[PDB]
């Protein structure tokens, strides 16, 4: 294959003097202008101001200043605010809305020295497992331009898979981080709910950012980059992982869901991952009396999701959800969260697919209820695949999406590693150890 | 009296056994709670058996930061086998089957729970009185109220019954009782400590906007340790070594309420003593949010949260979409405080405008009044001093400052930025040192 520097390797090269911040920034610009043609992932570009910031980083390096991401070029999802840059969420009506202040996540990454070259592609309203909008066009999977690289962080995942930038950052309310990392075969971490501030992830022309279920998290090509970006961006420093190796680790292996289906190639890939951990001293269960009702989980999650996305509004003549019923729904969520608390008293991590299949062909139908999917040559519902993603989003747990391999058509298959709440560093560390075990 | 850490060190050092320390606290309660009526739920039989179990762990060389330390907790927290009523008669015989999260954490650190402390009905008053247990009287003056919601907790601390407590706070429930009784109480950062087990009786409804739980003690060191034990994730420790260079915003006025003379000069005395220790003090700032708009937005959200979104028949309830917009108003107010704490390390202000008032019979706050320097001031408007930390989510420390003309304690409120709960404790400890020249 062809390789690039990771985020940490880039900072190491700049700090060591083998290259400068302006050289790494110019190399990233050239990679974008050379590879983004048939991919169309970096849809907002800030190259002139980025060269100035890289020159400012070289001036800091010269003054013996060292920061974890000093001079490291990166992009961020288009929904995040960067002062002077547009934030449209794909809407043609908000194409010329220019942010006047940097988002919290951008401010934290900048304070650590990161240089932002631009922003990556998204679907309209962030409501799709593709990345296509009338402002910028469509993002194509780098492994197969006929397939979707989407999930709403797809521009971000495509840029990482194409080697344009070593680090990115997305949001996730229905798989928006795990799914693009899965389709494009990169690393994505859905973080614990309320662990990272959503400030600056505003809907265009408002200051409305906070929303239940939704989180933001880092996306990269190595797990160590995820751990660094998480420490830079989290509200407070989260507990570091003490998991030294895989022996004794307790795994719950799920290759089936009561409300959706999975590829036989995906099922075997997840089984191959758990088997590599048994060979490293881990214990793997395939069922537990403490697994919450996943069927009831996705139903409660779906109805809370639709309420949050509609902001409590109902169609014409339809009666809306009352505020009292909303408080009861949040109680239903906390009840499910406690159910996962009992489960994680018996297990350290859940291994399961990110989605039932790999990247699907480009769709022009916005309505998910008017789509379908091809699984092992059979047709299946499209929206039903949300069940694979519901557990971490509804329960609030962190969930890692790490590369496993590829199916028969060369489309990447990823693993979903769900750990208990606030154990985001465990998920990263487990993913790091799983990759090494697969190397053996 | 021995504090929480001192009690753990004394038991570990052979000054007493966990059972002896348990018996000694039971004696202090039965000797002092007569005119106080603070520890209203008692679990002495199981506490002694838990104390004997702690002694076996001590002899087994196990060491935990609160091993064998006897304490109580606010009655609204669930303890397995004890009632949780929130002062309601209907819920007097609601027995919890499992410990609350805070109780479970404190027990895992070795704490021994003797019982629970008194509360008002529904945790909805600045007094502690209910038909199930009676009234709690301020240990400094039996005719004055002991504090609100967490009143039995603060009374037990001021009377030397137990060294550590824990309460909740949605409208000053931790700061006000600590103020009325002259003890330490920490209103923590919102969502920093799990409310699990602080359920409404016979439900699993504990989560609620604005409301937080926090420790209550007699020393700031006990607050920090109790915070580290109970927080969801360990919070950043404080790097503040002294008061030199600290940026303090001194507030003694509010556009919608008022504080009496002794309170105003007590807050200024704390500010001036930090100024003598190297801190810089300001009395105004352009980055100070509109406190009039804040207390209006806060009390609107407070009533909606307490009403669970219900409105009486005839009235139309707040729609869910309007509730979402209200939460955007709070987040907008939180960013406004973010910019304020870029210029200041802490706000110094009263906990309440006056000291502990006489026991009031009137349940309607609108029919109550307060004696402020002989004048008559509206009762409910005093929520203003409480609204900033609750609506903005910041941590707020309530620490002893002194007393007024009648010997009633006056406390200082120390507000720091969100997730700097240890900074608030640390600053409060340095203030206490500065006031002992
Ligand atoms: N029902 C449904 C809605 C949206 C998505 N897109 C997604 O993956 O998350 C979007 C992240 C938005 C953060 O506010 C998928 C399914
Ligand atoms: N994260 C998020 C996603 C979609 C919406 N939906 C919407 O259109 O509300 C815009 C706010 C209008 C305030 O007047 C809101 C937030
Ligand atoms: N309007 C108003 C309501 C309640 C209080 N009592 C208080 O201080 O907090 C109570 C803690 C409840 C935790 O759920 C004061 C004023």
Author numbering:
A (entry chain A): 15 to 454
B (entry chain B): 18 to 454
What do the authors report?
Here, the ligand‐free crystal structure of UMG‐SP2, a metagenome‐derived urethanase with depolymerization activities, at 2.59 Å resolution, as well as its (co‐)structures bound to a suicide hydrolase inhibitor and a short‐chain carbamate substrate at 2.16 and 2.40 Å resolutions, respectively, is reported. UMG‐SP2 belongs to the amidase signature protein superfamily (AS family), which is characterized by a highly conserved GGSS(S/G)GS motif and can be found in bacteria, archaea, and eukaryotes. SP2 shares the domain architecture of amidases, with an α/β‐fold containing 12 prominent α‐helices, 12 β‐strands, and five larger loops. Structural analysis and molecular dynamics simulations reveal that the flexible loop L3 consisting of residues 219–226 is crucial for regulating the hydrolytic activity of UMG‐SP2.
In addition, a SP2 variant with the catalytic triad serine mutated to alanine (S190A) was created and used to solve the complex structure (SP2S190A, 2.40 Å resolution) with the model substrate 4‐hydroxybutyl (4‐(4‐aminobenzyl)phenyl) carbamate (BBC) containing a urethane bond. The structures of SP2S190A and SP2 were solved by MR based on the refined structure of SP2PMS omitting the covalently modified S190. Likewise, when bound to the primary active site cavity of the inactive mutant SP2S190A, the phenyl moiety of the substrate BBC adopts a similar pose as PMS, with the scissile urethane bond in the vicinity of A190 (left inset). The aliphatic 4‐hydroxybutyl moiety of BBC crosses the oxyanion hole and enters a secondary cavity separate from the active site. The hydrophobic residues L140 and I187 bind to the 4‐hydroxy butyl moiety of the BBC ligand and form the secondary cavity of the active site, which partially accommodates BBC. Only one region near the active site of the substrate‐bound SP2S190A, belonging to the loop L3 (residues 219–226, corresponding to the loop L3 also found in UMG‐SP1), has a different conformation than the other structures and the computational model SP2AF2. Upon binding of BBC, K224, and concomitantly the flanking residues A223 and A225 perform a backbone flip that leads to a release of the active site steric blockage and the K224 side chain now points into the solvent as seen in the SP2S190A structure complexed with BBC (right insert). Interestingly, we discovered a second substrate binding site that is only found in the second molecule of the asymmetric unit of the BBC‐bound SP2S190A complex structure. R325, on the other hand, can directly interact with substrate in the secondary site, through the amphipathic part of the side chain or hydrogen bonds, since the guanidine group of R325 is within 4 Å of BBC's carbamate group, both of which are abrogated by replacing R325 with the smaller alanine.
